[PDB]
Structure formats: structure tokens, C-alpha cells
């Protein structure tokens, strides 16, 4: 046993960061001479190919991940040894770090990216390269990852099982309320980490050591 692992995190991080780097390189190259005119055939082969593809892929990945975490749920969750609970919630904190990064890419990088593109084209379509990546990829990805963190907590930690953490609810559902044109935000990660800390605090009575 080791209560701290972290392999899963680095995998999720490397896989996620190199993917978006590929996406950024891909749009630097095919943004010009593919993405400027949405009536051209190139737009179909380089941009709409992504769109038509990613939506079902994200939808299956989302239902597939939840369904899996539920089938593999701990049916004997109230019985969890203090140590294994400590591990499971270090794993939750892993999920939340990946989600941290996903949110950065989705809500900072690609969202403000759309800003510059609006000053580049006059828009043939709702589906600009910017939008294909931002609204139809970047956002659903972290939406998925958020639903996974929630489902992991609901299925592994007694506390997040029987209940629904109001804060964690806001975290999983809030994304499905992002809409632009044409303060109630997600930041409930605050409550979620306090619940975790609430729990780490309780998993030691002899805490003069800190």
C-alpha cells in the first residue's frame, strides 16, 4: 500500500495536454487555408469532420464513463478502512486536478481564443474552427471529466454516497448552463475541497503532529 499514487493523474495530464497541443497545432495549420471559408469543400474535410465526429465520441465517452464507475461502484462502501478512504480521496483530488486543467483549457484558452477569431472572419456559419474546438470539444471534455469526478466520489467515498454534495452538484451540472451570444458560476469546487478537508481532518485524532 501507498496512500499516495498519482500515476493515473500524470497519465490523464500528459494525455490531455498533448491532445490540446495537437489541437492547437492543427488549428494554426488548418485555420488558414481550410477554415476561412465555410462554403469551401476544405471546410468539410478539415473542420466539419471534427464536429460530426467529436459530439458522438464525447457523448459515448460520457455515458460510458459514468456507467462504468457505477457498475464498478463499492457496494460495501460504509465498511471502508480509514486508510483505503484516505487513498480513495487522494484519488478524488487527482480527478479534481485533471478537471482543473480541463477547465483551464476549456474556459480560459479556447474561450478567449474565440475572441481573436471573431476579429479575423465575418462568419459563414455558427460552426467556425474556434467554435468547433471551444463549444463542441473543449467544453464537453471537462463536462465529462467533471461528471467522472462526481461519480467517482458518489461511488467510492462514504459521504459523497447517500447525499449528493450540493457544491459537487453545482460543479457537475453548472457546465450544462454555459451559453453565450447571440454571477451564477461554477466555483463550487470551494465546497467540494472543504468537504474533502472536513474528511481528512476526521481521519486522525492525534493531530498535534500538525
Amino acid at each position: 500500500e501507498s496512500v499516495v499514487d498519482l500515476r493515473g493523474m500524470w497519465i490523464g495530464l500528459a494525455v490531455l495536454n498533448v491532445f490540446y497541443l495537437i489541437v492547437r497545432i492543427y488549428e494554426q495549420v488548418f485555420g488558414w487555408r481550410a477554415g476561412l471559408d465555410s462554403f469551401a469543400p476544405e471546410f468539410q474535410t478539415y473542420w466539419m469532420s471534427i464536429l460530426w465526429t467529436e459530439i458522438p465520441l464525447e457523448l459515448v465517452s460520457g455515458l460510458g464513463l459514468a456507467g462504468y464507475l457505477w457498475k464498478t461502484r463499492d457496494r460495501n462502501v460504509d465498511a471502508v478502512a480509514p486508510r483505503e478512504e484516505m487513498r480513495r480521496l487522494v484519488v478524488l483530488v487527482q480527478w479534481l486536478v485533471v478537471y482543473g486543467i480541463a477547465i483551464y483549457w476549456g474556459a480560459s484558452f479556447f474561450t478567449e481564443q474565440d475572441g481573436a477569431w471573431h476579429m479575423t472572419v465575418i462568419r459563414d456559419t455558427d460552426f467556425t474552427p474556434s467554435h468547433i474546438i471551444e463549444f463542441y470539444m473543449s467544453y464537453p471534455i471537462y463536462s465529462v471529466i467533471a461528471v467522472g469526478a462526481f461519480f467517482y466520489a458518489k461511488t467510492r467515498i462514504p459521504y459523497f454516497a447517500h447525499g449528493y454534495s450540493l457544491a459537487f452538484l453545482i460543479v457537475a451540472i453548472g457546465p450544462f448552463m454555459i451559453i453565450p451570444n447571440v454571477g451564477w458560476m461554477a466555483l463550487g469546487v470551494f465546497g467540494v475541497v472543504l468537504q474533502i478537508l472536513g474528511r481528512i481532518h476526521a481521519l486522525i485524532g492525534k493531530e498535534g503532529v500538525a
Partner: peptide, 19 residues
């Protein structure tokens, strides 16, 4: 071209085969 379902199908699968 089809780094649509490429790097994305491959990012989803290197994950699922690490369970």
C-alpha cells in the same frame, strides 16, 4: 484530416486501458 477520431479516440482509449 481525421485527427478528429484519431488523437481523440486514442486519448479516450489509452485512458480506459489504464483501469
Amino acid at each position: 484530416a481525421a485527427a478528429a477520431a484519431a488523437a481523440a479516440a486514442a486519448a479516450a482509449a489509452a485512458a480506459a486501458a489504464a483501469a
